[PDB]
Amino acid sequence: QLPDFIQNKIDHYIENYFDINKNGKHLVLGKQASPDDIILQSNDYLALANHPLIKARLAKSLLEEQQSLFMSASFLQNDYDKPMIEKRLAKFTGFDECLLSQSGWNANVGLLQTICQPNTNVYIDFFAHMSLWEGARYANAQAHPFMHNNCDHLRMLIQRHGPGIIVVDSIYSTLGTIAPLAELVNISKEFGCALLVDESHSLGTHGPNGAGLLAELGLTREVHFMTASLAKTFAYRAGAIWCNNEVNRCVPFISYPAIFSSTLLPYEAAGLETTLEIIESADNRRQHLDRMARKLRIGLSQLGLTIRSESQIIGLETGDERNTEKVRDYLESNGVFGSVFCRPATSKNKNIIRLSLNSDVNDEQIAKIIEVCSDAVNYGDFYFR
Amino acid sequence: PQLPDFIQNKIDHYIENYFDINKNGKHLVLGKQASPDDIILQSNDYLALANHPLIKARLAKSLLEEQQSLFMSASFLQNDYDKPMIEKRLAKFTGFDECLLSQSGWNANVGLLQTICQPNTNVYIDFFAHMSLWEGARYANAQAHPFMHNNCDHLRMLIQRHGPGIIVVDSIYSTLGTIAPLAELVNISKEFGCALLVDESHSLGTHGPNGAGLLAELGLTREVHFMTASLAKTFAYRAGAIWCNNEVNRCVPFISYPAIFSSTLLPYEAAGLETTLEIIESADNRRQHLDRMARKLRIGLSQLGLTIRSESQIIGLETGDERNTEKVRDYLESNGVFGSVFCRPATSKNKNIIRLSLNSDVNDEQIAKIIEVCSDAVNYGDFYFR
Numbered sequence: 198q199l200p201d202f203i204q205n206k207i208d209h210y211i212e213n214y215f216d217i218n219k220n221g222k223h224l225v226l227g228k229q230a231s232p233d234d235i236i237l238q239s240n241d242y243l244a245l246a247n248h249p250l251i252k253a254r255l256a257k258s259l260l261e262e263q264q265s266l267f268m269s270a271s272f273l274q275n276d277y278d279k280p281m282i283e284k285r286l287a288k289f290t291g292f293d294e295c296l297l298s299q300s301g302w303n304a305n306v307g308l309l310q311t312i313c314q315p316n317t318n319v320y321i322d323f324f325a326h327m328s329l330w331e332g333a334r335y336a337n338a339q340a341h342p343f344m345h346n347n348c349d350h351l352r353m354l355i356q357r358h359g360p361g362i363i364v365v366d367s368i369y370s371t372l373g374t375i376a377p378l379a380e381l382v383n384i385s386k387e388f389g390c391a392l393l394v395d396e397s398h399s400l401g402t403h404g405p406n407g408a409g410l411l412a413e414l415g416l417t418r419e420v421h422f423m424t425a426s427l428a429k430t431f432a433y434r435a436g437a438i439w440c441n442n443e444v445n446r447c448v449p450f451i452s453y454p455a456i457f458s459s460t461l462l463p464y465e466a467a468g469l470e471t472t473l474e475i476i477e478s479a480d481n482r483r484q485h486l487d488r489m490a491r492k493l494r495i496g497l498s499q500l501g502l503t504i505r506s507e508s509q510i511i512g513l514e515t516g517d518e519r520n521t522e523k524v525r526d527y528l529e530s531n532g533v534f535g536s537v538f539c540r541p542a543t544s545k546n547k548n549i550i551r552l553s554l555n556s557d558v559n560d561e562q563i564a565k566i567i568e569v570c571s572d573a574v575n576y577g578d579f580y581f582r
Numbered sequence: 583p584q585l586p587d588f589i590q591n592k593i594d595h596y597i598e599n600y601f602d603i604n605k606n607g608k609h610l611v612l613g614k615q616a617s618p619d620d621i622i623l624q625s626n627d628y629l630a631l632a633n634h635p636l637i638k639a640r641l642a643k644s645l646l647e648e649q650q651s652l653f654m655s656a657s658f659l660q661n662d663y664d665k666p667m668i669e670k671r672l673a674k675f676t677g678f679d680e681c682l683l684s685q686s687g688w689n690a691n692v693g694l695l696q697t698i699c700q701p702n703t704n705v706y707i708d709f710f711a712h713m714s715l716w717e718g719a720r721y722a723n724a725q726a727h728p729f730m731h732n733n734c735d736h737l738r739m740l741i742q743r744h745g746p747g748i749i750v751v752d753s754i755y756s757t758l759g760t761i762a763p764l765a766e767l768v769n770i771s772k773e774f775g776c777a778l779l780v781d782e783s784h785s786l787g788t789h790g791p792n793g794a795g796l797l798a799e800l801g802l803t804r805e806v807h808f809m810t811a812s813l814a815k816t817f818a819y820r821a822g823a824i825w826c827n828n829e830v831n832r833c834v835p836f837i838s839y840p841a842i843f844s845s846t847l848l849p850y851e852a853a854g855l856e857t858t859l860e861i862i863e864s865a866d867n868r869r870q871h872l873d874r875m876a877r878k879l880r881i882g883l884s885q886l887g888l889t890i891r892s893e894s895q896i897i898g899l900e901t902g903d904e905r906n907t908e909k910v911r912d913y914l915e916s917n918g919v920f921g922s923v924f925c926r927p928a929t930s931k932n933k934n935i936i937r938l939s940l941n942s943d944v945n946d947e948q949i950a951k952i953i954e955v956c957s958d959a960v961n962y963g964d965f966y967f968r
C-alpha cells in the first residue's frame with residue numbers, strides 16, 4: 198500500500214471510474230467478442246495486419262544480421278544512416294522531406310517542440326487529436342482552441358492574437374469529419390500563419406494511390422507540415438513528420454522523444470517499404486471502404502442519429518456515461534463492437550462510441566449494423582444524439 | 583510555401599549555433615564515420631543480445647502466426663484475457679506485484695508520473711535523473727525539487743521543507759554510470775513517509791540475481807513502491823515497463839495520455855520479449871564478463887588522473903565546454919574509439935560528457951586499447967578533462 202497523497206487520488210479514481218460501472222470495469226471495457234461478431238475497433242483500415250507479403254518482408258529483415266543500433270535517432274542522422282523509407286514516403290505524399298518517428302504521438306509532440314517557443318500562437322481545432330494539444334502544451338505555446346471546422350471563429354482568433362501555427366486533423370479521430378483544408382490554406386496565407394495537418398486518418402485511405410487528402414485536393418505544395426501515425430492504415434507502430442522546408446534537419450536534435458527515446462530498428466523501416474507498395478496499389482480496398490462507409494452513414498443518419506462523419510470513422514453520439522454504457526452493452530449483445538471514447542478524449546456528457554470500418558467489412562455486415570441500431574432505437578433503454 | 587518568421591528565426595539560429603559553429607558542419611554528436619576495425623561504445627545493448635539467433639527466431643516465428651488486427655490504444659486491451667503473459671513474468675522476474683507494458687521507457691515514466699501526481703505534488707528528483715523523469719513531473723504540473731547528485735543530506739532538507747512527496751532516481755545513471763544510494767533512499771523514504779520510484783533502465787538485466795536488477799540485488803524490492811525501465815537497453819527492444827508494488831498499474835492504462843492516445847505493442851512483440859527474458863535470466867556468463875571489463879576500464883582510467891564518477895558499465899569522460907568536447911571526440915575517433923557525445927539539452931552547456939557504453943562482446947585487448955588511447959590523450963592531447 199501507498200502514502201495518502203497518492204492513495205487518495207487512486208481511491209477516488211477507482212471509485213469514480215471503475216466502481217460506478219455495471220461490470221466494475223472502466224467504461225471502455227465491455228464483454229469479450231466472439232469470432233462471429235463484427236469488430237469495428239481497429240485503425241487498420243485496409244486490413245493489412247495479417248497480409249502475407251508484409252509479414253514475410255519483416256520476418257525476413259528480422260532474420261538478417263541486425264547491427265546493434267539501440268540508441269537515439271539523432272546518432273543516426275547522417276545520410277548513409279537515413280533509411281530509404283523516408284525518401285520514398287516524401288516522394289509518396291509529394292512533400293520535400295520525411296522523418297521517421299516512434300509513433301504518431303511522438304511525431305506531433307516532436308514537430309511542435311521544434312517549431313514552438315513559449316506563448317507561440319497555436320490555433321487548434323476543438324476536436325484535434327490529444328497528441329497535438331499536448332505537443333503544444335509541452336512547448337508552452339499559447340493554445341487558442343477554435344470551434345469545429347469553423348473558419349469564422351479561426352479568423353477572429355488569429356486577427357485577435359497575431360500570427361501562429363494552425364493545427365488540424367485532416368480527418369478527425371472521434372467524429373470522422375473532414376477539415377476544410379482549402380479554406381484553411383487560404384487563411385494561413387492571409388494571416389502569415391504556419392499550417393500543420395495530421396493525416397493519420399486519410400493517409401492510405403484517400404488520394405491518388407492513397408497518398409492522402411492534401412494530395413487528393415491538390416494542396417500538397419501549399420502546406421508547411423503534415424504528420425501521421427503509421428499505426429492506422431500502415432499498420433505499424435511508428436510515425437512520420439513531413440516538411441515542405443528544412444525543419445526536419447533540426448527535429449532530431451531538438452525533440453525530446455527524438456533525443457531521449459530509442460529509434461526504430463533498421464528492420465522496421467524495411468517492413469514499411471513493402472507496406473507502402475501494397476497501399477500504393479490497393480485502389481479496390483480503398484474504394485470498397487468508401488462505398489461501405491457511405492452506405493453505413495446513410496443508413497444510420499436516416500434512423501435519426503447525428504452522423505457527422507464523412508469517412509470510414511463513424512461516431513455514434515451517446516451522451517453521458519450511464520447512457521454510453523447502456524448503448525455499448527446493447528451493441529455488443531447484438532454482435533457489434535465499437536470503441537467507447539469517453540473522457541478525457543471527450544467531454545463527460547458528449548461520449549462517442551466510435552466505429553472504425555475497414556476494407557474487409559461486407560454489405561451483409563453493414564446491413565446488420567443498421568438493423569441493430571434500428572432495433573436499438575425502439576428497445577427503450579437509451580438514446581442517441 | 584514560406585515559413586512565418588517566428589519559425590524561420592529559430593531554425594536559422596539553430597542551424598547556425600549548432601551545425602555551422604562545428605568544424606565538420608554537422609551537430610556535435612556526429613563525428614566521422616566509424617569503420618569495421620574500430621571500437622564502438624555507443625550502444626545500450628549491454629549484453630550484446632541485438633543479434634541473438636533465438637530472439638530473432640522467436641520474434642519472426644511469432645510475427646508469422648495469424649495476427650488479429652490490434653491497432654488501437656492499450657486501454658481497450660486491459661481485460662485479463664487481453665493482457666500479455668510477459669507482464670506476469672516480468673513482474674515475477676523482479677519480485678514486483680504487477681507489471682505494465684509501454685511503447686518506450688520515456689512513456690513508461692511519463693505515464694506513471696501522470697497517474698500518481700496531482701498538481702503541486704512534491705517530486706524530489708536527482709539532478710542527474712533522466713529527462714523522461716523531469717518531463718514526466720513537469721507534464722503533471724508537479725512541484726519538482728531537485729536534489730544534488732546522490733546527496734542524501736540535500737534530499738533530507740528538501741523533504742523537511744516541502745513535506746511528503748515522490749523520490750525519483752535512476753538506479754544507475756545514464757550519463758555518469760554512478761549508482762544511487764538505494765538502501766539509504768529507502769531509509770529516507772521511511773523516515774519521512776514518501777514514495778519511491780526507481781528507474782532501472784541501466785541496471786535491469788545487467789545486475790542482480792539472473793539480472794533481476796539492482797533492487798533485487800540489494801533485497802530492497804518489497805520496500806520500493808515503483809520501478810520503471812526502458813526495455814531498449816539490456817533487453818534490446820523498443821518498449822518500456824512499469825512495475826508497481828500496489829494497484830497503480832490498474833489505472834495507468836486509462837489515465838496516462840501516451841497510453842491512451844498512442845497505439846499498443848502488437849502481440850508478436852510481447853512474445854519476442856519473453857524469449858529475451860529467458861536469455862537474460864541465464865546470461866550469468868555475460869554479466870560476469872561485463873562486470874570485470876568495466877572494472878578494468880574504471881581503474882585503468884582513474885590512474886591517468888581522470889575523474890571517473892562511474893561504478894558500472896557506463897563510463898563518463900567529462901570534457902567541459904563544447905569546443906573542447908569536439909576536440910576530445912575528434913581525437914578519440916581518430917584513434918579508433920567511438921563513444922556518445924552528450925551535450926545540451928542532456929547536459930548544461932559547460933559540462934558535456936563523452937559516454938563510453940561497454941557491452942559483453944568487448945574483450946581485454948580492446949579495454950587495454952581504450953586505456954592506452956586515453957593515456958596519450960591525457961598527455962599529448964591539445965585539450966583538458968574536468
Ligand SMILES: Cc1ncc(COP(=O)(O)O)c(C=O)c1O
Pocket residue numbers: 457458459685686687688689712714752756781783784811812813814820821822
Ligand atoms: C534511465 C533511462 N530511463 C528511460 C530511458 C528512455 O528509454 P526509451 O528509449 O525506451 O524511451 C532512457 C534513455 O534512453 C534512460 O537512460
Ligand SMILES: Cc1ncc(COP(=O)(O)O)c(C=O)c1O
Pocket residue numbers: 299300301302303326328366369370395397398425426427428434435436843844845
Ligand atoms: C489523429 C491521430 N493523430 C495521432 C495519433 C497517435 O498515433 P500513434 O498511436 O502512432 O502514437 C492517433 C491515435 O492513435 C490519431 O488518431
